[PDB]
Ligand binder design. Structure first.
Ligand SMILES: COc1ccc(Cl)cc1S(=O)(=O)Nc1cccn2nc(C)nc12
Ligand SMILES: N[C@@H](Cc1ccc(O)cc1)C(=O)O
Length: 293
């Protein structure tokens, strides 16, 4: 039964989260775990820190550059008693386009856990192995394990150190419409980035337009490559501004009635405090969302 969606995100082990379109509330999300294949677990924390396995980040990044935002179709081969769905995703509008699992195994960024589907995966794995790609390269793959830091040591120094020069980063999670979790590169600091000069509504049951603000920002920036101006800090959080070619998310959120200009932190906004007050004034005059009567 061929189903359809957009890629919301790609996870640890290249299980992919697929979403639909919303119809009164945020979109329905499904987490598909790729059938017949195995990729590494990414780094994670619990009792202790545990690092990236070999080749897990490069696998995640491969499907991320390739898939995020695109329209896929999928098919659910099984549903386990643990509450998980296994299946195959095809990057296109049909079950004969580009099987994403075949891309992984040909790059050597995954492996197999007879029939046409299983034959195609073999043909990919033999090629990858016979061209020394990914995990079939000479070595242990230690150069693919990120030196992942969960906290910045001296934050004021760290921000002062970059002199407001944008830092390439990946936006890994959206807590609410105005605070994100940003993977900074090339040092692999995973940290909390609050948008300088604004505040969206927030999750506790949630304030009006929190879920809407979260979605607005999340569908535009989750698992996208961005640059961040690190402007100041609040505790172990980075006050900053996000750059992307399509626009300024801070300037939009206010302009679209999803945010209010907060007085303290707007002093550190480098891109120009007049524009944030202007876009709020745009929303307020138009009676948009948080400004309705
Ligand atoms: C992946 O895309 C994005 C990344 C970052 C930002 Cl800040 C915006 C976008 S966007 O092009 O998707 N949206 C929009 C762009 C411009 C104006 N509007 N107005 C509405 C209502 N949306 C947009
Ligand atoms: N606009 C309001 C709903 C409302 C509008 C007009 C009224 O007179 C009363 C309530 C919300 O927010």
């Amino acid at each position: 039964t061929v189903q359809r969606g957009i890629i919301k995100m790609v996870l640890s082990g290249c299980a992919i989260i697929v979403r639909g379109q919303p119809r009164g509330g945020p979109p329905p999300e499904r987490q598909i775990n790729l059938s017949n294949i195995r990729a590494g677990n990414l780094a994670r924390r619990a009792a202790k820190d545990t690092p990236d396995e070999p080749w897990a980040f490069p696998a995640r990044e491969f499907l991320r550059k390739k898939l995020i935002g695109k329209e896929v179709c999928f098919t659910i081969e099984n549903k386990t008693p643990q509450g998980r769905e296994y299946g195959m995703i095809y990057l296109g509008k049909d079950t004969n386009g580009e099987n994403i699992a075949e891309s992984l195994v040909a790059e050597g960024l995954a492996t197999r856990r007879n029939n046409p589907e299983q034959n195609r995966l073999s043909e990919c794995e033999e090629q990858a192995k016979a061209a020394k790609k990914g995990m079939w390269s000479e070595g242990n793959g230690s150069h693919t394990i990120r030196d992942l830091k969960y906290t910045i040591e001296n934050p004021r120094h760290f921000v002062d150190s970059h002199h407001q020069k944008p830092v390439n980063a990946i936006i890994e999670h959206v807590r609410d419409g105005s605070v994100v979790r940003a993977l900074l590169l090339p040092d692999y600091y995973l940290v909390t980035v609050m948008l300088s000069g604004i505040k969206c509504p927030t999750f506790r049951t949630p304030e009006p337009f929190a879920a809407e603000a979260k979605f607005f920002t999340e569908s535009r920036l989750l698992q996208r490559d961005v640059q961040i101006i690190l402007e100041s800090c609040h505790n172990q959080n980075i006050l900053g501004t996000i750059l992307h070619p399509n626009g300024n998310i801070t300037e939009l959120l206010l302009k679209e009635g999803f945010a209010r200009c907060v007085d303290w932190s707007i002093a550190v906004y480098t891109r120009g405090a007049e524009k944030l007050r202007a876009a709020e004034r745009f929303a307020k005059e138009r009676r948009l969302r948080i400004w309705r009567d």
